[PDB]
Structure formats: C-alpha cells, structure tokens
C-alpha cells in the first residue's frame, strides 16, 4: 500500500532520512492520522512531504520497516510531543520505523499538486484538510511519480 506523511524539514527532512538509512517516525498527535499510521505494513511506501517550510511539497519516498508501536515521545517530558495524559500502560499514540527509498532533485510543490485532476481526492489538496498521515491510491501514486519526469 501507498501513503503520504508530513514533516517539517528543519526538524526532519528527506535528506536526514537518506543519511540515517532508517529512523523513527513519531510525534503524530491526530487520531485519524494515528489510525492510518497503525494500518501501515512493512514494505509499504510513502511520499515524504515537507511541511511548514519555504518550499512545501513532496520531497522524496520512504518505506515502512517496522509497524506501529507505542510512541516513546509521548512519555518523554523533554519531547515537544510529550502527552502528560499518556502512561506506559496507556499510551494513545503510535510511532513506527521508516527507511529511505528516494530523494527528489526537485520538490513537487503543493500548488503544483493541486493542479492535478488525478489528485483531487487526495486529502492533501482538499480545503480544510489537516491530516498529516494519509493513504494514497495506486492511481495517485503513479500520477505523482509521472510528475517527477
């Protein structure tokens, strides 16, 4: 299956993932996003979307290496994603491990993606959408890959 996940590049970029090889994706604090994250399977691929930056858009591709597990950042008071309501026995959040797949020479801007009729059903381009983790259909995935060329 295919997906798309958001990350601020100054915090964690596709370049960082390329360097690390594999890393932990955490800090997802939206139930709808969390639920999608929990359904991701090993081998699934996702578009790495750069958010809150000068050049927002799809910056590369990653893959799922380890499925969802309790997010350790929720229990860390020093983490920006700390959740005082979470406990070791009751953690409402999930993280997972991802791996590097590819990095784009040129980011596919949000505005550019919104111009694609084939992506009209993608939450990313829907007004009022604030979902950070979302599914991507095979058709949408192929359409975005074609945009690279």
TrEMBL record:
Domain of life the protein comes from: Bacteria
Pfam family, one: EVE
Record domain EVE: where: 1-146
Name of this protein: EVE domain-containing protein
Alphabetized InterPro entries for the sequence: 5hmC_binding, EVE_domain, PUA-like_sf, THYN1-like_EVE
């Amino acid at each position: 299956a295919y997906w798309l996940m958001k990350s601020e590049p100054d915090e964690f970029s596709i370049s960082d993932l390329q360097r690390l090889g594999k890393a932990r994706w955490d800090g997802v604090r939206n139930y709808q996003a969390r639920n999608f994250l929990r359904t991701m399977a090993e081998g699934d691929e996702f578009f790495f979307y750069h958010s809150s930056c000068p050049e927002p858009g799809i910056a590369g591709i990653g893959k799922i290496v380890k499925t969802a597990y309790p997010d350790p950042t929720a229990l860390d008071p020093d983490s920006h994603y700390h959740d005082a309501k979470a406990t070791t026995e009751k953690n409402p959040w999930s993280a997972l491990d991802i791996g590097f797949v590819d990095i784009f020479k040129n980011v596919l801007g949000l505005g550019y993606l919104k111009q694609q009729s084939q992506l009209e059903q993608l939450p990313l381009v829907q007004k009022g959408s604030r979902l950070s983790v979302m599914p991507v259909t095979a058709e949408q995935w192929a359409a975005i890959l074609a945009l690279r060329l």
